[PDB]
C-alpha cells in the first residue's frame, strides 16, 4: 500500500483529499449512534435530556 499523499494527490477540488462518508461524527454524543444493518454508517440520535 505504498501511497504518497504529498505527491499531489488532491482530487482536483478542495484540499487534503476530500472524502465520501455516509454519516459524519457527532462529538456531543448519541443515544446509540445507531448503526443500521450495514455497519459502515450510523444514525445520530443525540443524548438529549437526562440520558447523557
Amino acid at each position: 500500500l505504498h501511497l504518497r499523499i504529498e505527491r499531489m494527490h488532491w482530487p482536483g477540488s478542495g484540499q487534503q483529499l476530500p472524502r465520501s462518508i455516509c454519516s459524519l461524527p457527532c462529538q456531543p454524543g448519541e443515544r446509540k449512534k445507531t448503526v443500521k444493518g450495514m455497519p459502515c454508517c450510523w444514525h445520530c440520535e443525540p443524548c438529549t435530556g437526562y440520558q447523557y
Binding site: 443500521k36 444493518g37 450495514m38 444514525h43
Partner: protein, 61 residues
C-alpha cells in the same frame, strides 16, 4: 399505538417506535398531535377532548 420509524437506507426495512402517549397516528409513517388540553384517540385516529374538570357540587372540596 406504534409508528414505523423510517430508514430508506439500503432497503425498506422499518423500525418501530411507540408514539408520544399524547400523540395519535394520522399517518402510518409518522405520528400526529393536536393542541394542549386535548388527547389522542384510542386507536390514535385523531384528536380527542379530555373532559373538563371543575370543583363539583358534591365533591370533598
Amino acid at each position: 399505538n406504534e409508528v414505523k420509524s423510517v430508514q430508506p437506507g439500503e432497503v425498506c426495512c422499518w423500525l418501530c417506535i411507540p408514539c408520544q402517549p399524547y400523540e395519535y397516528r394520522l399517518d402510518e409513517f409518522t405520528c400526529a398531535d393536536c393542541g394542549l388540553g386535548y388527547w389522542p384517540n384510542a386507536s390514535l385516529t385523531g384528536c380527542f377532548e379530555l373532559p373538563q374538570e371543575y370543583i363539583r357540587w358534591g365533591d370533598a372540596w
